[PDB]
Design a binder for these strands. Structure first.
Ligand SMILES: [Mg+2]
Ligand SMILES: [Mg+2]
Ligand SMILES: [Zn+2]
Lengths: 64, 135, 39, 193, 140, 322, 103
RNA sequence: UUCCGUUAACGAACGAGACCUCAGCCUGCUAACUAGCUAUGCGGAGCCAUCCCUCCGCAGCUAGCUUCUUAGAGGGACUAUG
């Protein structure tokens, strides 16, 4: 099974996608405040938003 | 007085007044006329003349010197032209004139020099009397 | 039965305000008459 | 919680609890600055990014009712609709209808989506996260669209259709349009994870 | 001596509140403020009175003449009329500190009970029926 | 002993440009600002030692709004309530502090006005201006004379006038004017001629002072060098050195002290000993960019308290010890 | 001996009108007359919108032409000869002077 | 092609900008019976009724009237301050 994990956008990196509709941010896990990983988010997002992750493992790559 | 009562319940109260307060004549076309060129059916309520009277003596009581070609604009509205755009249309002058003439033939209003129609002192009196009796 | 005062043409006539000029003669003489292009 | 200003002078804004810490900053019911008598404030939002995170949720929901052209601009009707929806909601759950609305908004927001991005040289659709603000945006979109689609060609009034939609989404029961759409978007997203 | 006459403005509607030292009276165009009649936006006209309290109005009568605009714009103009009129009354007759009080209660709830909207209706430009919209374009 | 600190009051949004205090109606301070208001403060003298020594020296009482631009200088009536204020809109106004309404209005200064001052009989009113002219007004706000013009027209300055004050000697009324042309003049109300030209500073002048007994003529300004002069006949006694710009100057009512606002702190010299004995710093030293100057100062009637109005609409009050 | 004289001024140019309008008021201020003015009436903007093109081809573009007309009124109490003495000074081009007598 | 700056270029001309119109703020100025608000008088109508109180009408040598309306002169914003 999977458990929904909760993360915080700590810095926002850029705008990926063909049409720039996706942002790339670095998130930080609230339970383990040592695991910082890259994710892609759809929709407006600033520094400090809390992102819900259905799975935690998937980690984006630079300029994905 | 009249401005301290909601104008819907007041018109209901007054249109019940003219009913049980004696009488007035009523034309022999009241059941068939539409009250406006743009209307589809005659007024739905059989007691509409009195409503149209009670709503209308409040117009002269809050204003002064209103003719008939102004009441037609008061009670006019939107006319839909089928496939063409809708516009603004005026109501019928016959009912507008006849209700004022009847208010004259009861002494609620009177015709005004300089043109128009004005509320009478006694017509002011009963309107504030009935206003005193609305919840 | 209604022509341009400047050229006697029958189309695009401006009768507003009493001008009675056609839409092209009025443009050629607008500044002289006193019609300014502000906005 | 000394805040005695109440919606329509009926519904207390005290004791509304937002459970999701994720969207707690993007639902405007918890702080005193966001309490209102009425959901019709001629607010100058949309002027800046993230301003509408401050717009009261009840106003956002009301704003999303005035849709499909023959209803554009008709805000007083939508405010009356929300009033009756709320009276019905408390005439069903006997609970603070703000809490029911907020629970429905939280429960009806998708957390994943699948879009066509370009990886290493070839474009194809991958799954992505949803920001909290777009979660709230989509939640209101889904609930309002579901209610409007129920009310069309039906003797049920849009107020009652909306109330049923909101109570069902607050329950989380998979019978409202909002929940089924949420789960279908998230399934299309999972399939391409 | 208390009398101030303060206005409030919206799209085109303007309201003007004249103040006397009376008892509790608030009348818009001669009718009680209880009866401003789009009733869905009725708590909007009452926003200031419940924001301050009827008690803050125990010694003034307000005659508010409103004009122009439409129904919603007049309601918002009246809102601004009560708010700025109260601020001016406490400015000129009561106290400088207890007008700062009421100013802060009024301006923590909404900044446009005291500041009017500079938003106006943008003019229309040829090539479409609207400020921004254009006629639908066809190629073939 | 020395000056001590009690608190700071905040009633003006923009830079405070003048304070005036009464002698007969004591607990009524009035201060002007760049906000077109004109605030009047009431003094029960509270120090709320309940919330970290809660900071307020008093409670604002009344704003005289009505000027169309920055109010530059204000003064009070020497016998009653009235106040007179000058502003950038080219006007002078007479306010009545018992009701908060204006009572008179001195129209006629063709350009901006920078200084106002009353008189003993309160019939002799002076206005200094960016017009590069001085004008004398009666209590009725109508004209009787206007000194100015270029060399041919008369002896008026060529830059803007920046400040004017009276000589408080009763057998010889005069008026001293500091200018942006780097020149101080002394005039007479008898003939509106000049007694003397007190040719001093090398930079523009922004301040002139007359002794409470009318004996010596402190003037400050651009260079940071203050020059004291002789009221009897135009003689430069000695020079003092502040360093930075100078805006406001004042004398203690009875004690022999001269105070100055010099853009990094308030500097009080002594005239008993021509040497500084008191510097006064802003309480809050936050590292924001160049800190609030003090823009204006005034003593009370008894000299028991000095008021300083700064560039942030903050006014900090200074008492004495014993 | 004193009438109610109304002098009405119309123009297309604000400044040329206001120069004459101030001149009349001051010329009647030296005679210690009662001058109730100047009264300003709503500017009348005569507007004509015309197609730029003479031939109806291309983008349909319009130009809006406008004449602003300004209407001042001055009120006086005098005899018509004193006013005719006053309204005889040099008048700028484009200004209408149409003195009458009100009731 | 706005500017800083770099620099076999130096110094200039147009276009952009500036500019003009409208809208947005001004209880500050000038006023206004072809705009009005305020108070007072008389007139009506209500009413603890006699006054007071409320709502309209009407007339003026009421205004230390111009807030609302109109239109002129200006002011205001410069990214000014952090
Ligand atoms: Mg239609
Ligand atoms: Mg239906
Ligand atoms: Zn032609």
């Amino acid at each position: 099974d999977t458990q929904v994990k909760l993360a915080v956008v700590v810095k926002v990196m850029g705008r990926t996608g063909s049409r720039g509709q996706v942002t790339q941010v670095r998130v930080k896990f609230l339970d383990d405040q040592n695991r910082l990983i890259m994710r892609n988010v759809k929709g407006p997002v600033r520094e400090g938003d809390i992102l819900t992750l259905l799975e935690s493992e998937r980690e984006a790559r630079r300029l994905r | 007085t009249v401005k301290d009562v909601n104008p819907h319940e007041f018109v209901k109260a007054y249109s019940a007044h003219l009913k049980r307060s004696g009488k007035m004549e009523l034309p022999e076309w009241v059941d068939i006329v539409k009250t406006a060129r743009f209307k589809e059916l005659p007024p739905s309520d059989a007691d509409w003349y009195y409503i149209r009277a009670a709503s209308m003596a409040r117009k002269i009581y809050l204003r002064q010197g209103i003719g008939i070609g102004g009441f037609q604009k008061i009670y006019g509205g939107r006319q839909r032209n089928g496939s063409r755009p809708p516009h603004f249309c005026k109501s019928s002058g016959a009912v507008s004139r006849n209700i004022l003439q009847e208010l004259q033939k009861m002494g609620i209003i009177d015709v005004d020099p300089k043109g128009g129609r004005l509320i009478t002192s006694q017509g002011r009196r009963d309107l504030d009397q009935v206003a005193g009796t609305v919840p | 039965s209604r022509v341009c005062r400047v050229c006697g043409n029958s189309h695009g006539l401006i009768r507003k305000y009493g001008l009675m000029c056609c839409r092209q003669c009025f443009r050629s003489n607008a500044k002289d008459i006193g019609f300014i292009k502000y906005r | 919680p000394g805040g005695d200003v109440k919606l329509f002078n009926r519904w207390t804004f005290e004791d509304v609890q937002v459970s999701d810490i994720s969207l707690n900053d993007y639902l405007a019911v918890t702080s005193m600055k966001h309490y209102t008598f009425l959901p019709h404030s001629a607010g100058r939002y949309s002027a800046k990014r993230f301003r509408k995170a401050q717009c009261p949720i009840i106003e956002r929901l009301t704003n999303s009712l005035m849709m499909h052209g023959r209803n554009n601009g008709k805000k007083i009707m939508a405010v009356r609709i929300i009033k009756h929806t709320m009276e019905i909601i408390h005439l069903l759950t006997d609970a603070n209808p703000i809490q029911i609305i907020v629970d429905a908004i939280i429960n009806s927001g998708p957390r994943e989506d699948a879009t066509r991005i370009g990886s290493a040289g070839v474009v194809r659709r991958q799954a992505v996260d949803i920001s909290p603000l777009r979660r709230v945006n989509q939640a209101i979109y889904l609930l309002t669209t579901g209610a409007r689609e129920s009310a069309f060609r039906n003797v049920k009034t849009i107020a009652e259709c909306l109330a049923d939609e909101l109570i069902n989404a607050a329950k989380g029961s998979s019978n409202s349009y909002a929940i089924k759409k949420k789960d279908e978007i998230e399934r299309v997203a999972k399939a391409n994870r | 001596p208390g009398t101030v006459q303060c206005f409030g403005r919206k799209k085109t509607a303007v309201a003007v509140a004249y103040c006397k030292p009376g008892r509790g009276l608030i009348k818009v165009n001669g009718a009680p403020i209880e009866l401003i009649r789009p009733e869905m936006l009725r708590l909007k006209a009452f926003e200031p009175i419940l924001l301050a309290g009827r008690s803050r109005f125990k010694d003034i009568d307000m005659r508010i003449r409103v004009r122009g605009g439409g129904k919603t714009s007049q309601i918002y103009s009246i809102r601004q009329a009560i708010a700025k009129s109260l601020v001016a009354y406490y400015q000129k007759y009561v106290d400088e500190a207890a007008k700062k009080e009421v100013k802060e209660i009024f301006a923590r709830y909404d900044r446009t009970l005291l500041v009017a909207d500079p938003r106006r209706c943008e003019p229309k430009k040829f090539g479409g029926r609207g400020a921004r919209a254009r006629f639908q374009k066809s190629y073939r | 002993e020395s000056l001590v600190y009690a608190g700071v009051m905040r009633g003006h949004n923009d830079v405070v440009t003048a304070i005036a205090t009464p002698i007969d109606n004591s607990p009524f301070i009035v201060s002007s600002s760049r906000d077109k208001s004109l605030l009047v403060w009431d003094l029960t003298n509270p120090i709320q030692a309940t919330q970290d020594s809660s900071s307020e020296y008093g409670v604002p009482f009344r704003r005289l709004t009505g000027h169309g631009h920055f109010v530059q200088d204000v003064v009070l009536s020497s016998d009653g309530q009235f106040a007179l204020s000058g502003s950038w809109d080219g006007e002078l106004r007479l306010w009545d502090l018992s009701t908060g309404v204006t009572t008179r209005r001195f129209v006629g200064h063709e350009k901006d006005v920078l200084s106002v001052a009353f008189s003993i009989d309160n019939r002799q009113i002076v206005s200094a201006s960016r017009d590069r002219t001085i004008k004398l007004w009666n209590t009725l706000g109508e004209c009787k004379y206007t000194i100015g013009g270029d060399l041919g027209g008369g002896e008026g300055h060529t830059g803007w006038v920046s400040c004017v004050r009276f000589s408080p000697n009763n057998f010889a009324p005069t008026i001293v004017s500091g200018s942006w042309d780097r020149s101080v003049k002394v005039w007479n109300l008898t003939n509106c001629k000049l007694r003397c030209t007190l040719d001093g500073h090398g930079g523009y002048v922004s301040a002139v002072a007359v002794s409470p007994d009318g004996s010596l003529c402190a003037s400050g300004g651009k260079d940071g060098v203050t020059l004291l002069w002789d009221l009897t006949e135009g003689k430069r006694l000695y020079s003092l050195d502040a360093g930075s710009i100078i805006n406001s100057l004042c004398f203690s009512p009875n004690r022999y002290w001269l105070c100055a606002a010099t853009q990094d702190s308030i500097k009080i010299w002594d005239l008993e000993s021509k040497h500084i004995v008191q510097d006064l710093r802003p309480e809050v030293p936050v590292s924001t960019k160049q800190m609030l100057y003090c823009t204006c100062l005034s003593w009370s009637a008894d000299g028991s308290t000095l008021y300083a109005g700064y560039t942030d609409g903050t006014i900090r009050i200074y008492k004495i010890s014993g | 001996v004193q009438h109610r004289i109304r002098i009405t001024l119309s123009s297309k140019s604000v400044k040329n009108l206001e120069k004459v309008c101030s001149d009349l008021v001051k010329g009647a201020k030296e005679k210690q007359l009662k001058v109730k003015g100047p009264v300003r009436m709503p500017t009348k903007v005569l507007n004509i919108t015309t197609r730029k093109s003479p031939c109806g081809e291309g983008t349909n573009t319009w130009d809006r032409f406008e004449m602003r007309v300004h209407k001042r009124v001055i009120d006086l109490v005098s005899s018509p000869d004193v006013v005719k003495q006053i309204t005889s000074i040099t008048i700028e081009p484009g200004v209408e002077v149409e003195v009458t007598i009100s009731d």
